[model samples]
Target chain A: YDSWEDLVSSIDTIERKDDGTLEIYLTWKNGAISHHPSTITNKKCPQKMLQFYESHLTF
Target chain B: QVENYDSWEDLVSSIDTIERKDDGTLEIYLTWKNGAISHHPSTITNKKCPQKMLQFYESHL
Candidate 1:
């Protein structure tokens, strides 16, 4: 959220599927949760957010 | 329906939605050229899949 460390720490879970793809779950500071399919580089995410996201991306 | 994409050779794509289902199941809906849709458990179309998806997203910026 506020920092890459914050984002990395906010990740509540990372599940690896039978297909070898990843599922990353994010928890907002307020405790809201988000489920992401595949990578985290969606254009919908702010550019600043992506700076942190791009570094952690995997496929 | 498929024919509607005949002229769409630019290889377009989009994410229609990511939803928590009626059973509380999570699903991501991805739409590629010609309205073709795929849901998970995703058997990704490979490296080019994520690569192409990120590239397709650039146009949104």
Candidate 2:
């Protein structure tokens, strides 16, 4: 939340659906949990958006 | 209804809500000055989709 590193580290789980959707769960330092949905489907999902999540997972 | 705007600011200011569809498209709801409603279906990769919209979605939704 405060920084990109903080945001990446906040991730608790990632759920990939059979239909190609993604549910990224975040557990913030404040103890709040959020569910963020995303995708990697070409054209529907942005390259930057996909890369943001992908990069987070790599770290 | 589908409507066109001259500027992204104009379009953004009129937004009522943004719904992310199952197919990864956004269902954008807009309310006009005259109380007219417009719906725009778009994707994050779309040129028309602004960074503010993306940020809003990430932070709030």
Candidate 3:
């Protein structure tokens, strides 16, 4: 049993070598972005927000 | 389902190392997971990703 970390991204440009190896480019988020832009890569790229909301969060 | 988390500070808290590879690209030490499966010392690359989630992270800024 092993453990892993997750990186959330908006892009899914993956390159699979021999179907065994997979690599991808992702623009991950930090508290800040860019400065040569050392970015992020995650295993799961989940979804989109349909509403810009309130209640639990407010604008 | 493995809910995709959406924060930089939260995600990178687990990084073990950052070094150069024999192929001249950088190597970031990480792990991989998909629900019940996992592996250690996984490689995340500038070499590929999910593109839309970035907009939300971008929106926060």
Candidate 4:
């Protein structure tokens, strides 16, 4: 199995809709990943790591 | 019934190979003669999935 690569920073755009699903976008530059999400679902994603993933992910 | 092709060229030339699942998702899978594999998920509209698969065929196949 391919090991899940860790994002260097965090993913960028995670969008959450009224239906409660979450959308996430991640970008990488200068060897760092940045992340952003639409909603802060306390269950699936924690606020800090979510930010970290947004900032550091590559793909 | 869906047709399955042994090559990427055959699959692309025959658009029928591209299909939608019952869940309203689209997907394509290719397994090269060398055993390298690639797939695309229809759930997302981004071009990365198709682009990557194409690039893999162009470079290796």
How does model 4 fare in lDDT?
0.37
What DockQ does each prediction reach against the true complex?
A: 0.07, 0.06, 0.05, 0.05
Error of 1 at A57 (Å): 21
How accurate locally is residue A17 in candidate 3, as Cα lDDT from 0 to 100? 51
TM-score of each: 0.27, 0.33, 0.21, 0.22
Report how far residue A38 has shifted in candidate 4, in Å. Answer: 34
lDDT of 1 by residue, B1-61 (tens): 3323223224537645444557754444677688787764212321224344344333333
Q: For candidate 4, write residues A1-59 as lDDT tens digits.
A: 10122322344444555775555555443565543333332222333333343233332
- For model 3, the TM-score of its B chain against the native B chain is 0.29
Candidate 2 ranges beyond 4 A from true positions:
A1-47, A50-59, B1-7, B20-24, B32-36, B44-46
What is the TM-score of candidate 3?
Answer: 0.21
DockQ of candidate 2 relative to the true structure: 0.06
Candidate 1 lDDT over residue span A1-59, tens digit each: 21333343254445677886666666666667777753562323333233333344331
The model with the greater lDDT, 3 or 4, is 4
Docking class of 1: incorrect
lDDT by residue for model 2 (B1-61), tens: 3322224544454445656668855566766556678778644223354443444444432
Q: Chain A TM-score for model 2, please?
A: 0.45
Every candidate's lDDT: 0.44, 0.48, 0.30, 0.37
Residue-wise C-alpha lDDT for candidate 3, range A5-46, written one tens digit per residue: 233323324444574443444444553222112122332322
Displacement of the residue A41 alpha carbon in candidate 3, Å? 7.6
Give the candidate order by descending TM-score: 2, 1, 4, 3
Q: Which stretches of candidate 1 lie over 4 Å from their true place?
A: A1-7, A11-59, B1-12, B41-61
